[PDB]
């Protein structure tokens, strides 16, 4: 009763309850996946068309940080955007002192340390977002997914949203089919497939698919949006597969 | 007991499921759950499924 009320007070048995509660917010959000490839990394999110009044490709939820790190999130959608600010502030701060873009493992650590503060004190609220962010630098590609607790892990692939289960089982099967790492050029196509399957869950409102990629081979380490003809080939490929 | 013997059918007039405006899909799922594992109990026994208890 009184451990339920409180923030940042340990339960008798030893767990924080409001970390657990903060997970709920991740499952309300829409699907998003990352796929780590041999070249770099692909990001993709399901953007729900909740009315005929929204405009197409103008209410983009994919947001870069610097010019080599893709970011898309699930949780509470204002609360996402403010962590994409925080990231920018730290990114930029590193470029002043050490004159080089920030390394991707380092980008992870400091971003995490912010989340961690809001479970240290009782006075601000534990952040209600699970994020995917990653990109390529000199060490290579890295994928990360950050949980509201303040924990990240590296991954061959990761996913988040209400349709995480349906993507997690295909993602094993894209570690079996291609055990040496598929090319990122193949993986535009493979990304679409995994959104079109995890849309039966959110089949309530029709969708619009968004991919983006950052890889050393294609885009010269510069994160971009897949657009025009390359976006048309991936759409028609996953649509005719799942029907 | 005498409470259970009164609870027993008395034939209540149907209102018909077609005069219940809207809610098309809710009538099918209800029909699927209660009415059709009684009548078609051969196609549950070939398949090998159990009937939904409620």
């Amino acid at each position: 009763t009184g451990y339920d009320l409180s923030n940042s007070v340990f339960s008798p048995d030893g767990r924080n309850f409001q970390v657990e509660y903060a997970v709920k917010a991740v499952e309300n959000g829409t699907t998003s996946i990352g796929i780590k490839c041999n070249d770099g990394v692909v990001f993709a999110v399901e953007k729900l068309i909740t009315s005929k009044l929204l405009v197409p490709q103008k209410n983009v939820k994919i947001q870069v940080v610097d010019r080599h790190i893709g970011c898309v999130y699930s949780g509470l959608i204002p609360d996402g955007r403010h962590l994409v600010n925080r990231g920018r502030e730290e990114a930029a701060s590193f470029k002043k002192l050490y004159k080089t873009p920030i390394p991707i493992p380092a980008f992870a650590d400091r971003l995490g340390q912010y989340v961690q503060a809001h479970t240290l004190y009782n006075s601000v609220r534990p952040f209600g977002v699970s994020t995917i962010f990653g990109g390529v630098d000199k060490n290579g590609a890295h994928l990360y997914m950050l949980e509201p607790s303040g924990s990240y892990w590296g991954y061959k692939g990761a996913a988040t949203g209400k349709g995480r289960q349906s993507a997690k089982a295909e993602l094993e099967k894209l570690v079996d089919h291609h055990p040496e790492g598929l090319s990122a050029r193949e993986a535009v196509k493979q990304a679409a497939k995994i959104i079109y399957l995890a849309h039966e869950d959110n089949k309530e409102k029709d969708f619009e698919l968004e991919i983006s990629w950052c890889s050393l081979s294609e885009t010269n380490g510069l994160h971009k949006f897949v657009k025009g003809d390359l976006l048309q080939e991936a759409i028609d490929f996953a649509q005719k597969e799942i029907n | 007991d005498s409470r259970v013997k009164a609870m027993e059918v008395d034939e209540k007039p149907t209102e018909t499921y077609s005069d219940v405006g809207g809610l098309d899909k809710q009538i099918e799922e209800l029909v699927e759950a209660i009415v059709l594992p009684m009548k078609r109990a051969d196609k549950f026994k070939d398949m090998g499924i159990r009937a939904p208890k409620g």
Binding site: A117, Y121, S123, V124 | -
Partner: protein, 125 residues
């Protein structure tokens, strides 16, 4: 972030006495024993050593310390609040008698410096 225990956490009982002061002694009574005997030409202070395992070597931990070269001190109660309390003590002995009279403090005066810390750990929220 924002401290919101600006108010005091100690208050008088509607029966008189401060509630937390009284508790704090019962925690001292649980502790390890130790003793002190004043003699004519010296003092003796001494405590036992309570470990968890014979794996824990207790030689490394010191429960008797020096404040100044002439004033030692021994304790019972919360192990960690001894660690910091002795530090706070050594440090403010030095910033109130090492600069301003050279010599280490007389023994009455050092006791009183320690006493200011305690009172004050009850006044601030």
């Amino acid at each position: 972030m924002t401290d919101r225990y600006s108010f005091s956490l100690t208050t008088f009982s509607p029966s008189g006495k401060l509630g937390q002061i009284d508790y704090a002694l019962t925690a001292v009574k649980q502790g390890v024993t130790s003793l002190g005997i004043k003699a004519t030409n010296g003092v003796v202070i001494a405590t036992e050593k309570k470990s968890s395992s014979p794996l824990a070597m207790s030689e490394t931990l010191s429960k008797v310390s020096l404040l100044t070269p002439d004033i030692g001190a021994v304790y019972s109660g919360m192990g960690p609040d001894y660690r910091v309390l002795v530090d706070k003590s050594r440090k403010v002995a030095h910033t109130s008698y090492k600069r301003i009279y050279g010599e280490y403090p007389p023994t009455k005066l050092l006791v009183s410096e320690v006493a200011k810390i305690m009172q004050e750990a009850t006044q601030s929220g």
